[PDB]
Amino acid sequence: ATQGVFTLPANTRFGVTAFANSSGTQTVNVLVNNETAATFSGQSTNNAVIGTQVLNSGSSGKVQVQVSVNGRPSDLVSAQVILTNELNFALVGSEDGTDNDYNDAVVVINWPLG
Numbered sequence: 001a002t003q004g005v006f007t008l009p010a011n012t013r014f015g016v017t018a019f020a021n022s023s024g025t026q027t028v029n030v031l032v033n034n035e036t037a038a039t040f041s042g043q044s045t046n047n048a049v050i051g052t053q054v055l056n057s058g059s060s061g062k063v064q065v066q067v068s069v070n071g072r073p074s075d076l077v078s079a080q081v082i083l084t085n086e087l088n089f090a091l092v093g094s095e096d097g098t099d100n101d102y103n104d105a106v107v108v109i110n111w112p113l114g
């Protein structure tokens, strides 16, 4: 089942924040309408943020997150959760190796902003 793929409301600003918990330098790409929109890198085993940015969902609102470590794509878990019918989280977990903790890069997408 596809993961890291999120339909947002069109032409809406959203925040995207990534955290690293791994030996591997995480490289997370944030694609809007299949065009690369953000790119983050950093290495941490202590939940350091390797990038935070404000993007626009574009005309299509298709946001996709991808995680790789030196070119090897990680395995992704994701879901979207909505609180009081207004506050949206698109959550991404990512696993680069053996232990299946799925926090190697943690990516949080939240909206609306402002």
Ligand SMILES: *C(=O)C[C@@H]1O[C@@H](C)[C@@H](O)[C@@H](O)[C@@H]1O
Pocket (backbone or CB within 6 Å): 021, 022, 023, 024, 045, 095, 096, 097, 098, 099, 100, 101, 102, 104
């Ligand atoms: C290799 O050690 C795997 C890797 O790095 C560890 C420090 C730990 O974060 C593990 O979850 C990660 O996949």
Ligand SMILES: [Ca+2]
Pocket (backbone or CB within 6 Å): 094, 095, 096, 097, 098, 099, 100, 101, 102, 103, 104
């Ligand atoms: Ca792991």
Ligand SMILES: [Ca+2]
Pocket (backbone or CB within 6 Å): 021, 022, 101, 102, 103, 104
């Ligand atoms: Ca980890």
